[PDB]
Symmetry: none
């Protein structure tokens, strides 16, 4: 038997500046 359960809680709170720059394969020239 397989009793699998994923409890994924992703809480994110911001009260200031965020500069989240993600470059997956980006090529700047």
């Amino acid at each position: 038997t397989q009793r699998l359960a994923n409890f994924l809680v992703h809480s994110s709170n911001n009260f200031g500046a965020i500069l989240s720059s993600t470059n997956v394969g980006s090529n700047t020239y």
Copy 2:
């Protein structure tokens, strides 16, 4: 028997400056 359970809580709080720059394969010129 397999009793598997993943309790993943990812809490992130910000009150200031964040510059999260992730370059997965990025190539700057």
Copy 3:
């Protein structure tokens, strides 16, 4: 029998400056 359980809590709080620059394969020129 396998009784596996992962309790992963990832709490991160910021009150100041953060410059998190991660370069996984990035090539700067």
Copy 4:
């Protein structure tokens, strides 16, 4: 609570109190990525 076996309980405590009582002057300047030319 748990009696027989295989007992796992995790308790998380998080009383974050961010109190800022400004009775005066605050001159802040947040510049993330800016560039003054």
Copy 5:
């Protein structure tokens, strides 16, 4: 609580209190990535 066997309980304590009571002048300047030319 747990009686027989396989007893794991984890307790996390987090009373974070960030108190800032400014009765005067604060001249802050946060520059993350900025460049003054």
Copy 6:
């Protein structure tokens, strides 16, 4: 609490108190990555 065997309990204590009571002048300058030309 645990009676028979296999007893593991972990307790974490975290009373962080960051108190900053400025009754005067603070001239701060945080420059992370900045470059003044």
Copy 7:
């Protein structure tokens, strides 16, 4: 006396690939 003369000849010839990217103040995110 001032006898000033500027002989400025700017000759440019191309027979192949050129990628001339000039960023005077440009800010890529």
Copy 8:
């Protein structure tokens, strides 16, 4: 007396690949 004369000849020829990337003040994120 001032006898000034500037003979500026700027000849450039290309027969292949050129990637001339100049960043005067450019800020990549």
Copy 9:
């Protein structure tokens, strides 16, 4: 007397690959 003369000849020829990346003040993140 001032007899000044500038003979500036700037000849550049290419037959292959060139990657001329100049960063005067550029800040990569």
Copy 10:
């Protein structure tokens, strides 16, 4: 030519000969800035 004084003559020689006589197969691929995903 110049006889008395202040004699400056500059001669530039430029016989560039780019000759390419392909009697066979040339498989070239110029990729400047391209990105094959």
Copy 11:
């Protein structure tokens, strides 16, 4: 040429001969800035 004084003559010689006579197969691949994902 120049007789009295202040004699400056500069001669530049440039016989560049780029000859490429391909009687066979050339498999070239110029990749400047490219990125094969």
Copy 12:
């Protein structure tokens, strides 16, 4: 040429001959800045 004084003549010689006679197979691969993922 120059007779009296102040004699400066500079001669530059440049017979560059780049000859490439390929009677066979050339497998070249120029990768400047490329990144094969």
